[PDB]
Scaffold this active site. Sequence first.
Site, PDB file in Angstrom:
ATOM      1  N   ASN A 168      32.537  36.707 -38.343  1.00 38.16           N
ATOM      2  CA  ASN A 168      33.034  37.954 -38.939  1.00 38.16           C
ATOM      3  C   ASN A 168      32.144  38.385 -40.109  1.00 38.16           C
ATOM      4  O   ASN A 168      32.631  38.947 -41.099  1.00 38.16           O
ATOM      5  CB  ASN A 168      34.515  37.807 -39.359  1.00 38.16           C
ATOM      6  CG  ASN A 168      35.168  39.102 -39.866  1.00 38.16           C
ATOM      7  OD1 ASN A 168      35.945  39.065 -40.831  1.00 38.16           O
ATOM      8  ND2 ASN A 168      34.929  40.217 -39.189  1.00 38.16           N
ATOM      9  N   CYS A 178      34.411  38.146 -33.796  1.00 33.59           N
ATOM     10  CA  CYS A 178      33.209  37.383 -33.445  1.00 33.59           C
ATOM     11  C   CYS A 178      33.346  35.991 -34.075  1.00 33.59           C
ATOM     12  O   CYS A 178      34.407  35.613 -34.581  1.00 33.59           O
ATOM     13  CB  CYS A 178      31.931  38.128 -33.866  1.00 33.59           C
ATOM     14  SG  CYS A 178      31.795  38.394 -35.677  1.00 33.59           S
ATOM     15  N   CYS A 201      28.609  39.495 -38.987  1.00 30.94           N
ATOM     16  CA  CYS A 201      27.580  40.317 -38.347  1.00 30.94           C
ATOM     17  C   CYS A 201      28.191  41.232 -37.298  1.00 30.94           C
ATOM     18  O   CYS A 201      28.334  42.433 -37.544  1.00 30.94           O
ATOM     19  CB  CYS A 201      26.492  39.443 -37.725  1.00 30.94           C
ATOM     20  SG  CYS A 201      25.534  38.488 -38.922  1.00 30.94           S
ATOM     21  N   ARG A 202      28.593  40.708 -36.142  1.00 29.70           N
ATOM     22  CA  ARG A 202      28.931  41.611 -35.045  1.00 29.70           C
ATOM     23  C   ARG A 202      30.242  42.363 -35.285  1.00 29.70           C
ATOM     24  O   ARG A 202      30.286  43.593 -35.159  1.00 29.70           O
ATOM     25  CB  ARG A 202      29.000  40.825 -33.745  1.00 29.70           C
ATOM     26  CG  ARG A 202      27.619  40.305 -33.304  1.00 29.70           C
ATOM     27  CD  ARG A 202      27.717  39.254 -32.240  1.00 29.70           C
ATOM     28  NE  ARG A 202      28.236  37.985 -32.789  1.00 29.70           N
ATOM     29  CZ  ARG A 202      28.515  36.919 -32.039  1.00 29.70           C
ATOM     30  NH1 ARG A 202      28.358  36.971 -30.716  1.00 29.70           N
ATOM     31  NH2 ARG A 202      29.033  35.817 -32.589  1.00 29.70           N
ATOM     32  N   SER A 203      31.340  41.645 -35.562  1.00 31.00           N
ATOM     33  CA  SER A 203      32.619  42.350 -35.606  1.00 31.00           C
ATOM     34  C   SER A 203      32.760  43.271 -36.824  1.00 31.00           C
ATOM     35  O   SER A 203      33.385  44.331 -36.687  1.00 31.00           O
ATOM     36  CB  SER A 203      33.794  41.371 -35.517  1.00 31.00           C
ATOM     37  OG  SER A 203      33.788  40.401 -36.557  1.00 31.00           O
ATOM     38  N   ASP A 222      24.858  36.974 -30.858  1.00 29.91           N
ATOM     39  CA  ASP A 222      24.887  36.696 -32.289  1.00 29.91           C
ATOM     40  C   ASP A 222      23.510  36.930 -32.892  1.00 29.91           C
ATOM     41  O   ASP A 222      22.558  36.195 -32.538  1.00 29.91           O
ATOM     42  CB  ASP A 222      25.340  35.252 -32.492  1.00 29.91           C
ATOM     43  CG  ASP A 222      25.499  34.884 -33.949  1.00 29.91           C
ATOM     44  OD1 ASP A 222      25.078  35.679 -34.792  1.00 29.91           O
ATOM     45  OD2 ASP A 222      26.084  33.807 -34.227  1.00 29.91           O
TER      46      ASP A 222
END
Length: 154
Positions: A12, A9, A14-16, A126
């Site tokens: 690196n 993301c 939050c999402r990934s 995001d």
Amino acid sequence: ATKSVLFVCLGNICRSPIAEAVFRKLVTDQNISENWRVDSAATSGYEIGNPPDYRGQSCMKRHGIPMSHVARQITKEDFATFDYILCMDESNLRDLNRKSNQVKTCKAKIELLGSYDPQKQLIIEDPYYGNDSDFETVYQQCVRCCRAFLEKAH
Ligand SMILES: O=C(CS(=O)(=O)O)Nc1nc2ccccc2s1
């Protein structure tokens, strides 16, 4: 195989890292974590060295999913070593494709993680400027996408 997947993301944080943690738990629950190299990285350098946003930790604690990571930026090596690079939105995808064309060896198949969603939510947005419910949405998207990817890669 050993098989490998890198979730990517923007930051690196939050999402990934959530995707990575969800995926590692799935393969560990199926006794095959030894068969998989799982990691996450950032397209950007905005958060290098930082752990996941604590709002994402709170979400993962609620769901019983261990998460431990320090942010790092994707490198030229990652394109040679990973079988799959699964990213969150079209800007990530564009940036990863740009970087991939600067290296000689690109083993990785680069795709949106959301392309695995049976519910067809293509983009994993995001949540950084959102709230806890946005992190929950991200978590649920990762569960659906990671389960489908493990079942059959594109
Ligand atoms: O890091 C994340 C979230 S994720 O990509 O890790 O899911 N989002 C960012 N927004 C911003 C906005 C401004 C400056 C730096 C950043 S970093």
